[PDB]
Amino acid sequence: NFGAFS
Amino acid sequence: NFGAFS
Amino acid sequence: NFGAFS
Amino acid sequence: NFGAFS
Amino acid sequence: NFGAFS
Amino acid sequence: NFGAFS
Amino acid sequence: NFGAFS
Amino acid sequence: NFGAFS
Amino acid sequence: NFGAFS
Amino acid sequence: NFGAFS
Amino acid sequence: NFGAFS
Amino acid sequence: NFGAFS
Amino acid sequence: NFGAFS
Amino acid sequence: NFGAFS
Amino acid sequence: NFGAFS
């Protein structure tokens, strides 16, 4: 799972 | 799962 | 799953 | 699990 | 199984 | 199974 | 598990 | 199993 | 099992 | 099992 | 050469 | 060469 | 060469 | 060469 | 060469 600016 | 500016 | 500006 | 600015 | 930006 | 930007 | 600015 | 930015 | 930025 | 930035 | 959101 | 969000 | 969020 | 958040 | 948050 990857979140950036989210 | 990938989210950027989302 | 991929979301950008969404 | 990876979160940056999220 | 391989996922990149997904 | 292969997913990129998906 | 990895969190930065999150 | 391989995940990068995912 | 291999995870990077994931 | 291998995890980096994950 | 591959560019996405770049 | 690979660039994403870069 | 690989750049992500860079 | 690999850069992430860099 | 590897840079993360650097």
Q: At how many Å resolution was this determined?
A: 1.1
DSSP E1-6: -EEE--
Say which residue the tokens 């995870």 belong to: I3
Alpha-carbon distance values, H3 to C5, C6, G6, K4 (Å): 22, 22, 21, 18
Chains in touch with D (3+ beta-carbon pairs under 8 Å) read A, G, I, J
For residue L2 the two structure tokens come to 């690979």
> What residues have CB less than 8 Å from A2, skipping those under 6 apart?
B1, B2, B3, D2, D3, E5, H5, H6, I5, I6
Whether residue N4 and residue O1 make contact (CB cut-off 8 A), yes or no, is no
Torsion of CA A1, H6, L1, K6, to 10 degrees: -60
**Which residues of chain B from 1 to 6 reach within 8 Å of chain A, CB to CB?**
1-6
Q: Which residue from D6, E2, J1 is spatially nearest to B4, judged by alpha carbons?
A: D6
Residues of chain D contacting I6 with CB distance shorter than 8 Å: 1-2
